Amino acid sequence: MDVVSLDKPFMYFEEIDNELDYEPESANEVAKKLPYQGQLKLLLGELFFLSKLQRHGILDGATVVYIGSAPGTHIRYLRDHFYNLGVIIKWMLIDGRHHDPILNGLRDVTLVTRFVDEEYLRSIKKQLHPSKIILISDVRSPSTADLLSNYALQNVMISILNPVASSLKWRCPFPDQWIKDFYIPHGNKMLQPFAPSYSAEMRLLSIYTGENMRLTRVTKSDAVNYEKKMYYLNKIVRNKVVVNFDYPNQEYDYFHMYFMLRTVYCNKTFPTTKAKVLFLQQSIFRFLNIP
Amino acid sequence: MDVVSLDKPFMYFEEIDNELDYEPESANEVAKKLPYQGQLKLLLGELFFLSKLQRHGILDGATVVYIGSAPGTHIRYLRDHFYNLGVIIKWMLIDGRHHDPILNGLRDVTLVTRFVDEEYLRSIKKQLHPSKIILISDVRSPSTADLLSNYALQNVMISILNPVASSLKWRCPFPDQWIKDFYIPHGNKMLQPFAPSYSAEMRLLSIYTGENMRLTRVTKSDAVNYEKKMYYLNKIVRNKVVVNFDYPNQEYDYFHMYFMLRTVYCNKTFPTTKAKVLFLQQSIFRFLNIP
Ligand SMILES: Nc1ncnc2c1ncn2[C@@H]1O[C@H](CSCC[C@H](N)C(=O)O)[C@@H](O)[C@H]1O
Numbered sequence: 001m002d003v004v005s006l007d008k009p010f011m012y013f014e015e016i017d018n019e020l021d022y023e024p025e026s027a028n029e030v031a032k033k034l035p036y037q038g039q040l041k042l043l044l045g046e047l048f049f050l051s052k053l054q055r056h057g058i059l060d061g062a063t064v065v066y067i068g069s070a071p072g073t074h075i076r077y078l079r080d081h082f083y084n085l086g087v088i089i090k091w092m093l094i095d096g097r098h099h100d101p102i103l104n105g106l107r108d109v110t111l112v113t114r115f116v117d118e119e120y121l122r123s124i125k126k127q128l129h130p131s132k133i134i135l136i137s138d139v140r141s142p143s144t145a146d147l148l149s150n151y152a153l154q155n156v157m158i159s160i161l162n163p164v165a166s167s168l169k170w171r172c173p174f175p176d177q178w179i180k181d182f183y184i185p186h187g188n189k190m191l192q193p194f195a196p197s198y199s200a201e202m203r204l205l206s207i208y209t210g211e212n213m214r215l216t217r218v219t220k221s222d223a224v225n226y227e228k229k230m231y232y233l234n235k236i237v238r239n240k241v242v243v244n245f246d247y248p249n250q251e252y253d254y255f256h257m258y259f260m261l262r263t264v265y266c267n268k269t270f271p272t273t274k275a276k277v278l279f280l281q282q283s284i285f286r287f288l289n290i291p
Numbered sequence: 292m293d294v295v296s297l298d299k300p301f302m303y304f305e306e307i308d309n310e311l312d313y314e315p316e317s318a319n320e321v322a323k324k325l326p327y328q329g330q331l332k333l334l335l336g337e338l339f340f341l342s343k344l345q346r347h348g349i350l351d352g353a354t355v356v357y358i359g360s361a362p363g364t365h366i367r368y369l370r371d372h373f374y375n376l377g378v379i380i381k382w383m384l385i386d387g388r389h390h391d392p393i394l395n396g397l398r399d400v401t402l403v404t405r406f407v408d409e410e411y412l413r414s415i416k417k418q419l420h421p422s423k424i425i426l427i428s429d430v431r432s433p434s435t436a437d438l439l440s441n442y443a444l445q446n447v448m449i450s451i452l453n454p455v456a457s458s459l460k461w462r463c464p465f466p467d468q469w470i471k472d473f474y475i476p477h478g479n480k481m482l483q484p485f486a487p488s489y490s491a492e493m494r495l496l497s498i499y500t501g502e503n504m505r506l507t508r509v510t511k512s513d514a515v516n517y518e519k520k521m522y523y524l525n526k527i528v529r530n531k532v533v534v535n536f537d538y539p540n541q542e543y544d545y546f547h548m549y550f551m552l553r554t555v556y557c558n559k560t561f562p563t564t565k566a567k568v569l570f571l572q573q574s575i576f577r578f579l580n581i582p
């Protein structure tokens with residue numbers, strides 16, 4: 001067994017303290033172990049991001065514009081969590097594909113069947129005005145050309161919608177597939193537990209203060225760095241059993257999930273953080289139909 | 292006579308302490324009083340910007356990419372000033388129009404007859420590499436659509452060329468001609484002495500630290516503000532005779548120019564700042580053929 005003792009898990013990209021040369025043979029290795037693991041991945045990352053906005057007093061009364069939301073099965077849990085907490089939020093879910101019918105029949109959530117473009121963003125902004133907007137993007141076309149195209153759309157989402165905070169899908173193109181240096185919004189690179197086995201994807205979390213917009217250039221050397229750091233995280237780290245983690249499941253991703261869940265607010269009062277986490281996790285797994 | 296006593300002139304936009312409702316009748320008023328006043332305007336603003344980079348140790352060894360440089364008569368003075376100072380700089384002047392022949396025959400300055408586009412910027416960056424780039428843009432197509440188009444090109448100049456500092460042409464579109472909110476690079480809004488009588492134009496001066504790029508949104512309300520502040524500066528301020536300004540010329544623009552010229556470095560040592568300024572001004576006017 002691959003046992004280890006850790007204080008805390010890597011929460012953000014910069015925390016990764018090591019790197020490994022990427023082995024193309026890892027692509028042939030099992031990417032997932034849990035059913036609906038993709039929804040789980042999304043649900044934790046988005047509960048984490050949103051509970052933070054709550055902490056900063058910017059969630060209540062906002063409209064959450066989720067682009068690339070279908071099927072969005074896990075969004076029903078998020079919606080319920082904050083609704084039962086008393087937070088007022090309107091959800092506007094937009095995708096060209098169809099949403100999980102469990103999202104229908106709620107006055108607070110609007111489902112839109114449209115692939116967004118810069119023009120469409122302009123009209124929703126006019127229609128959402130003067131409400132405060134929180135943006136979540138999970139759009140997917142892939143080629144480095146597809147990526148750049150997605151990243152270029154997400155930057156336009158921010159400039160047109162002018163959100164108070166944003167969660168964006170972020171995976172650096174692979175160095176050996178570089179095309180050109182590009183800019184991405186400045187934010188925290190939140191690492192994702194339950195991401196596919198060798199995924200280099202994270203979520204770019206940002207809060208907008210003032211009327212400024214800070215971007216950051218991404219170069220090929222940066223692309224090499226992402227690859228080695230994420231390859232070390234995936235191959236080595238995520239494969240560890242954290243023995244000093246007293247929890248029903250000691251695998252790294254559960255240790256990592258625990259740290260995200262401990263930040264979530266609840267109505268029920270608990271004697272320990274472990275009590276809360278076990279509860280939220282149980283709750284989350286039952287909702288998602290994960291054994 | 293319109294006399295007044297001032298401590299210092301308004302150097303940047305934010306310093307303007309008042310505003311006036313714009314009178315469309317001012318457009319019918321004499322825009323210039325000095326021959327080659329446009330070159331004078333450009334020469335001071337660019338000497339000021341560049342002497343600053345010198346102060347920060349970022350001028351020497353750089354290539355100054357000037358886009359929108361023709362005829363560029365005044366660029367010959369700038370070139371000579373820093374060359375005679377011992378600063379090593381290559382000048383790359385690019386415009387589709389023709390440059391003043393006084394710029395030919397200098398190994399340190401390259402004249403390019405090309406209207407730049409995003410593609411061309413990419414090739415010059417590849418060819419200029421690995422040299423440090425300082426960008427100066429003075430491109431002009433006008434309509435608010437022309438403006439946005441120019442501003443959109445200038446932002447691409449920065450992202451592709453990735454300069455260490457930039458001077459950009461900046462004039463906000465008029466509120467009654469608003470089309471849409473847009474982003475501009477973050478920088479100091481340097482005010483321009485000898486600008487046309489009712490010009491709302493300034494130069495956006497920026498120094499790039501780290502690999503970050505900070506932008507700032509410009510809205511219609513911002514556009515209203517620019518108009519009233521610049522209208523107050525032009526109609527009232529620039530029309531003042533600064534009596535406590537002991538200088539051969541006490542008009543505001545000369546008082547304003549003095550403050551810019553006092554920042555310029557010289558080989559000759561002078562007993563007073565007035566001695567230096569008189570010298571540089573005399574020198575500048577003789578070069579430009581301004582009485
Ligand atoms: N321009 C665009 N606008 C909206 N949705 C888009 C889009 N381009 C791609 N998409 C959507 O991006 C999605 C990527 S998968 C999204 C999964 C979703 N976040 C969930 O919780 O299950 C696809 O449904 C695709 O239709």
Ligand SMILES: Nc1ncnc2c1ncn2[C@@H]1O[C@H](CSCC[C@H](N)C(=O)O)[C@@H](O)[C@H]1O
Binds near residue numbers: 362365407408430432
């Ligand atoms: N894409 C582009 N590339 C280069 N020059 C451009 C341009 N679009 C416009 N221009 C130039 O922008 C200039 C504006 S006037 C520039 C004056 C110059 N800075 C001087 O010191 O005298 C015109 O010469 C025009 O040809």
Ligand SMILES: C[n+]1cnc2[nH]cnc2c1N
Binds near residue numbers: 027174175198230
């Ligand atoms: C996940 N993943 C997949 N294919 C690649 N090619 C190069 N790097 C990678 C990577 N990290």
Ligand SMILES: C[n+]1cnc2[nH]cnc2c1N
Binds near residue numbers: 313465466490521522
């Ligand atoms: C200079 N100038 C010219 N035309 C305008 N129309 C509205 N504002 C202006 C302005 N400042």
